[PDB]
Amino acid sequence: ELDQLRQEAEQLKNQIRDARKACADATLSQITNNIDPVGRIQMRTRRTLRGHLAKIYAMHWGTDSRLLVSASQDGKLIIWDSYTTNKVHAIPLRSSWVMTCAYAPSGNYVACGGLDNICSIYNLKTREGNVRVSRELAGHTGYLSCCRFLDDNQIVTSSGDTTCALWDIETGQQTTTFTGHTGDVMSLSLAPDTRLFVSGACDASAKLWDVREGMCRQTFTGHESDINAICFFPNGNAFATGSDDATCRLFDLRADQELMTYSHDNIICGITSVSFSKSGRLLLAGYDDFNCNVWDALKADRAGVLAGHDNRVSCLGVTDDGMAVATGSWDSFLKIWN
Amino acid sequence: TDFRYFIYAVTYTVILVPGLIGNILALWVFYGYMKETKRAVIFMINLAIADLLQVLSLPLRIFYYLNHDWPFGPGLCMFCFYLKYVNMYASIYFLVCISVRRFWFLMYPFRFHDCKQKYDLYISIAGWLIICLACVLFPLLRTSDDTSGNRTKCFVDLPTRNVNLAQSVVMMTIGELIGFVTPLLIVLYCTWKTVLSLQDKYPMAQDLGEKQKALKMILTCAGVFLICFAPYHFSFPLDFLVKSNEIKSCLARRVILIFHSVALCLASLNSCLDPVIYYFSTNEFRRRL
Amino acid sequence: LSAEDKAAVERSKMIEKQLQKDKQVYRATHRLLLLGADNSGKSTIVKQMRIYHTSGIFETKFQVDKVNFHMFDVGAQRDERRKWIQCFNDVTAIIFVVDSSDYNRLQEALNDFKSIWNNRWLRTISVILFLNKQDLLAEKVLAGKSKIEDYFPEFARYTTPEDATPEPGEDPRVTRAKYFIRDEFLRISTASGDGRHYCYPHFTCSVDTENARRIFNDCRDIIQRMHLRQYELL
Amino acid sequence: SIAQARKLVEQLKMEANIDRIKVSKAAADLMAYCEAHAKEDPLLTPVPASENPFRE
Amino acid sequence: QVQLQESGGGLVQPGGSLRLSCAASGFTFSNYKMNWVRQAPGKGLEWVSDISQSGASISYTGSVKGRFTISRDNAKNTLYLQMNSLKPEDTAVYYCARCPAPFTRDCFDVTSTTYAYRGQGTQVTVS
Ligand SMILES: CCCCCCCCCCCCCCCCCC(=O)OC[C@@H](O)COP(=O)(O)OC[C@H](N)C(=O)O
């Protein structure tokens, strides 16, 4: 019966742990102990963007490194030009409880979702000057927590019914589902090649997923509490995570182990977002105590601090030319650092 | 004069120092409340400035009343005589504004959002302007046409311009009605409606007594306003008529002069008792400082 | 400013005007969150408040003395709620409904009350408590078959308050029962409070016609107490 | 259930036969990429104020 | 990997006594608040007892308030419950539960149907 099944499972877990333990000859810090530091790094705020009425809950930058989108619970989406602080679009929603947004890589569409369990897709470039809903995807059984386009035809979602799905916009129907997680799925990150992706859940676990097969390829388990954020290192061979135990960590895909830990004893608040830099050297993170931190990714050092918000920091991101960082908080303000 | 100079000297000396301390420190503590809370104090700032200037204009008066001479010329004497009273009436204006604001947001709580404080700036400057106009009547009516006096003439020994009695009555009555009666009626009506809204047949007993403290503070503010400003405005017309040689009896002259001296000294104390009643008793000045 | 500069400026200024009209309607309306279990009668309160007029959430609108309220009810979620609850950190009030004649599930309702009261993003929000189904409680107490102190051992040592209000001439036994169950929730709300939020309890049943007036009065008290704090220095 | 424990076992079996490498090679690879692109990172090395679009 | 393994169950005659223990692994034991829950035949999950980070504040449900006792040992990473006078109504499965986050006062979702930081359970039969 199930007693034997569980005993076999425990044996296989012992085998996996020993297979990983045989591979641990060196530590990253021993390899990098002969390296110069980066010194102190100091950033300043160039623009402050004003206009929302309630807490800002998500944002996303554009491939065109100039334009931006952001979402707020008063029920609005705004599209900004960040060189001039000069609003381009403002869009009113049907439900006020939104939690995610995303640009398409071509600048033709934006998307959003939230507490009603639907994904809605907006078309900006119509012959009409107006902006109207094109699609409403309607099959999930819990709220929508993240979202990322892949092209103008296909989109990937994660929800609070503990599944992720891949969707076909022109037809409207799901094409594949990913089911193995146990708690809510909180984030999601696409690969540079768009053939793999990773996710982390309200369960101290991350999984690597194959888009085209619809299967799980690997599982990574190092944290203590719910994982709130996740992202890929630039060459496609690594990823970093941050959770409610107030730690960030770096995992490697080929070695199949945890590789570096970034923490401190004075930090006892959870982490809301993480983000990498363009050469991979700086890892930037956001926290519940109103500030953001800058770590050297190779040394577990603490090379900088960004301050200036009054309420919880909820979102953060870096552009494709690597020039500037954008942050958003429960203040209802957005800020650009460089 | 033999029973006026000394009272003025002692009173202004005592009023001098704590007014400096309170107003300066209070503007300094205001400075940090906007560096952390993105809120506006506007009527409070204008009160504090008006009180600061009024307490500032005193030392020349003290020196003159002690040494019985003025070695500086008339162009400065006129400006001091103007400055004191302009600041007094600005102070009264801002107290009335604060009273009406509290009435509004406690009597009608659903009709008061943060997009309503639109013209608080437009109010302030507007008032600060009209007063500076209407008070010019103080130095114009104090220098008599032709006299050859310019050395001892400062602050109580100035002549009085010779005027018709009927025009005197008209001007004095309009000044009493615009400067005292209207503000007092507004303040009493609004205190009456505000203390009715802070009581009800529902004590929660799980409370901390927050509505009773507010009730007591509203009553204290109204009482101090009334006591510090009523005697001066009752004694003002009699004193001006004695200065115009309209009342002849020596008894009436001596009594009226002494009484108005006392009343003016008593109305000068608000610049020191304001920083103790409006702020310096809040919880926001005792979580800072 | 050339062509593109001026056109982009004129466009962002029209957007500014429309956002100005939106702000006013947003600020003249009050949001409420409705909570309770399924043996509680929450929907009947929802239906009594309709005469004032496969989804994840439901809304009902009502108006009293020319003021507008929006009430929000959550349906079609899983039973784990430590994440979506955070969306509600700035409602005017929470409304908690409880089936008061069900002795066998009251400890679970008390555990719900504690978790809501002590959370980090919900610690400046007030609660209006409805103690529903009073005719059933009356019938049970009179019938004499079941006992309170089988579930709550301290009822044996309870005496009615002095300021109880048994006006309609009801039995003293029903009055002890009512006030004991109320004092249980008021003990939790007074233990850990800090002065920044309170609780407002009411006794009710299924044929009451006057719950919108009670909600009106309690929100008036809440908003006045908030005014006193934000504007000590005006 | 039998379905749940069976699927758990099948997944563990699928994951238990994946090829692995030593830690030092992967650490050296991350370090080599980092060193290769280190002078084109414009937040690690700030640009002159003429090239910055946010101070022109 | 977070693990909680709980033991001590079995068969008792009414009036007897019993002791249960949990061994924890994979988290820093002392930042967390700990709980005991149970499930009887034909019902749902029910909350039994409660202890906080240091052991100072304790809490019990109404029907066990004079009979059960809860404690913890942070140097050995262990949790304990002791049961003194058992009744036929105590026949159930017992589970050991953890609070979701550290340094926290509220305790959401610990009796839900699926929950990630709960163990496998132990059977207790009284007859
Ligand atoms: C809200 C309110 C506002 C409105 C405004 C209006 C205006 C009013 C109105 C006002 C009215 C007009 C009138 C005029 C009269 C003149 C006279 C004089 O002189 O005066 C002063 C008295 O008093 C007294 O004095 P001794 O005694 O001379 O002495 C002085 C001393 N020593 C100092 O100074 O120092």
Short mmCIF file of C-alpha atoms in Angstrom, two decimals, chain C residues 38-205:
data_model
loop_
_atom_site.label_atom_id
_atom_site.label_comp_id
_atom_site.label_asym_id
_atom_site.label_seq_id
_atom_site.Cartn_x
_atom_site.Cartn_y
_atom_site.Cartn_z
CA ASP C 38 -21.32 29.52 6.16
CA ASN C 39 -23.46 28.52 9.14
CA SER C 40 -23.83 32.22 9.99
CA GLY C 41 -26.55 33.88 7.90
CA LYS C 42 -24.28 36.38 6.14
CA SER C 43 -26.27 36.32 2.89
CA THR C 44 -29.51 37.31 4.64
CA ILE C 45 -27.86 40.49 5.89
CA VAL C 46 -26.71 40.92 2.26
CA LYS C 47 -30.32 40.54 1.03
CA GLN C 48 -31.87 42.83 3.63
CA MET C 49 -29.39 45.42 2.40
CA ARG C 50 -30.54 45.19 -1.23
CA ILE C 51 -33.59 47.43 -0.66
CA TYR C 52 -31.23 50.40 -0.17
CA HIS C 53 -29.63 50.18 -3.64
CA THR C 54 -18.11 31.60 -11.53
CA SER C 55 -16.41 34.76 -10.25
CA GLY C 56 -13.85 35.34 -7.50
CA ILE C 57 -15.60 38.18 -5.62
CA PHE C 58 -19.09 39.77 -5.27
CA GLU C 59 -20.20 43.37 -4.62
CA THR C 60 -23.36 45.05 -3.24
CA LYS C 61 -24.06 48.79 -3.09
CA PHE C 62 -26.35 50.70 -0.75
CA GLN C 63 -27.03 54.28 0.33
CA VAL C 64 -28.21 55.79 3.63
CA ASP C 65 -28.89 59.49 4.41
CA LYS C 66 -27.34 60.36 1.01
CA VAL C 67 -24.05 58.51 1.73
CA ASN C 68 -22.67 55.60 -0.34
CA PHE C 69 -21.34 52.22 0.85
CA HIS C 70 -19.79 49.36 -1.20
CA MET C 71 -19.65 45.96 0.52
CA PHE C 72 -17.37 43.16 -0.70
CA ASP C 73 -17.87 39.41 -0.27
CA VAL C 74 -15.29 36.80 -1.29
CA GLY C 75 -16.30 33.63 -3.10
CA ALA C 76 -14.46 30.98 -5.11
CA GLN C 77 -11.11 30.95 -3.33
CA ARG C 78 -9.26 28.20 -1.50
CA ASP C 79 -9.36 28.01 2.26
CA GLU C 80 -5.85 29.46 2.71
CA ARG C 81 -6.09 33.24 3.01
CA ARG C 82 -2.81 34.71 4.32
CA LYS C 83 -2.07 36.37 0.95
CA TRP C 84 -5.22 37.84 -0.58
CA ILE C 85 -6.30 39.28 2.80
CA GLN C 86 -3.48 41.82 2.38
CA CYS C 87 -5.44 43.54 -0.38
CA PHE C 88 -7.76 44.94 2.28
CA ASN C 89 -5.44 47.04 4.43
CA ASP C 90 -7.41 50.27 3.94
CA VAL C 91 -11.15 49.58 4.05
CA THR C 92 -13.27 51.66 6.41
CA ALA C 93 -14.44 48.64 8.42
CA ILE C 94 -14.75 44.87 8.63
CA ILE C 95 -18.13 43.31 9.40
CA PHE C 96 -17.91 40.01 11.25
CA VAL C 97 -21.06 37.85 11.40
CA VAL C 98 -21.47 35.00 13.94
CA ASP C 99 -24.10 32.27 14.48
CA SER C 100 -24.67 32.70 18.19
CA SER C 101 -26.90 29.66 18.85
CA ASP C 102 -24.31 27.09 17.73
CA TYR C 103 -22.37 26.12 20.85
CA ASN C 104 -20.23 23.58 19.04
CA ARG C 105 -18.37 25.92 16.67
CA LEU C 106 -17.85 29.09 18.75
CA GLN C 107 -14.19 28.48 19.60
CA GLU C 108 -13.39 28.45 15.87
CA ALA C 109 -15.10 31.85 15.48
CA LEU C 110 -13.06 33.19 18.39
CA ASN C 111 -9.85 31.97 16.68
CA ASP C 112 -10.90 33.81 13.50
CA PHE C 113 -11.41 37.02 15.49
CA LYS C 114 -7.94 36.78 17.07
CA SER C 115 -6.12 36.22 13.77
CA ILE C 116 -7.84 39.19 12.14
CA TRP C 117 -7.23 41.49 15.14
CA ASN C 118 -3.50 40.75 15.50
CA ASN C 119 -2.29 40.84 11.84
CA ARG C 120 0.31 43.42 10.80
CA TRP C 121 -1.49 45.03 7.86
CA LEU C 122 -4.94 45.00 9.53
CA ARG C 123 -4.11 46.65 12.86
CA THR C 124 -5.68 50.05 12.26
CA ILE C 125 -9.08 48.82 11.08
CA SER C 126 -12.26 48.63 13.16
CA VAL C 127 -14.71 45.74 13.34
CA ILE C 128 -18.50 45.76 13.59
CA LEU C 129 -19.71 42.51 15.16
CA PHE C 130 -23.15 40.97 14.48
CA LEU C 131 -24.41 38.26 16.83
CA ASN C 132 -27.02 36.61 14.63
CA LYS C 133 -29.91 34.19 15.24
CA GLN C 134 -31.22 35.23 18.66
CA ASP C 135 -34.57 33.43 18.47
CA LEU C 136 -32.78 30.09 18.16
CA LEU C 137 -30.67 30.93 21.21
CA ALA C 138 -33.80 31.81 23.17
CA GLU C 139 -35.49 28.53 22.23
CA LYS C 140 -32.42 26.45 23.15
CA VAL C 141 -31.93 28.11 26.52
CA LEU C 142 -35.57 27.61 27.46
CA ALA C 143 -35.78 24.02 26.19
CA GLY C 144 -33.05 22.96 28.63
CA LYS C 145 -31.53 20.04 26.70
CA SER C 146 -28.02 21.42 26.03
CA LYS C 147 -25.60 23.35 28.23
CA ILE C 148 -23.09 26.13 27.68
CA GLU C 149 -20.63 25.05 30.36
CA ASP C 150 -19.99 21.74 28.60
CA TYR C 151 -17.94 23.79 26.11
CA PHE C 152 -16.97 26.84 28.21
CA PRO C 153 -16.32 25.79 31.82
CA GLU C 154 -16.30 29.33 33.22
CA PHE C 155 -20.02 29.99 32.63
CA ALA C 156 -20.72 28.52 36.06
CA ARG C 157 -19.19 31.62 37.68
CA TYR C 158 -20.78 34.37 35.58
CA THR C 159 -23.25 37.02 36.74
CA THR C 160 -25.02 39.50 34.48
CA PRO C 161 -23.61 43.04 34.23
CA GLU C 162 -25.38 45.88 36.05
CA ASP C 163 -25.88 47.93 32.87
CA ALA C 164 -27.56 45.11 30.97
CA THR C 165 -30.73 46.16 29.16
CA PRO C 166 -33.38 43.40 29.24
CA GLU C 167 -36.21 45.70 28.19
CA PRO C 168 -38.80 43.44 26.47
CA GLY C 169 -39.47 41.42 29.62
CA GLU C 170 -37.45 38.38 28.57
CA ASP C 171 -36.24 35.61 30.87
CA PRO C 172 -33.10 36.24 32.99
CA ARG C 173 -31.55 33.04 31.65
CA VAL C 174 -31.52 34.25 28.05
CA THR C 175 -29.93 37.49 29.28
CA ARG C 176 -27.05 35.70 31.00
CA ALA C 177 -26.45 33.69 27.84
CA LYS C 178 -26.45 36.75 25.57
CA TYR C 179 -24.09 38.80 27.67
CA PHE C 180 -21.67 35.93 28.32
CA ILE C 181 -21.21 35.29 24.63
CA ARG C 182 -20.69 39.01 23.95
CA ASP C 183 -18.09 39.42 26.69
CA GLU C 184 -16.03 36.62 25.14
CA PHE C 185 -15.27 38.66 21.99
CA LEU C 186 -14.83 41.93 23.91
CA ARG C 187 -12.11 40.35 26.07
CA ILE C 188 -9.96 39.57 23.01
CA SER C 189 -10.45 43.00 21.49
CA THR C 190 -9.45 44.78 24.69
CA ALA C 191 -6.46 42.56 25.52
CA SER C 192 -4.15 43.54 22.67
CA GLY C 193 -5.47 46.84 21.45
CA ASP C 194 -3.32 49.95 21.41
CA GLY C 195 -5.90 52.74 21.06
CA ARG C 196 -6.00 52.76 17.25
CA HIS C 197 -9.10 50.63 16.64
CA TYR C 198 -12.24 49.43 18.45
CA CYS C 199 -15.13 46.95 18.24
CA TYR C 200 -18.89 47.65 18.08
CA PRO C 201 -21.22 44.76 19.06
CA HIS C 202 -24.94 44.36 18.19
CA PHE C 203 -27.56 41.65 18.86
CA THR C 204 -29.62 40.72 15.81
CA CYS C 205 -31.86 38.15 14.12
#
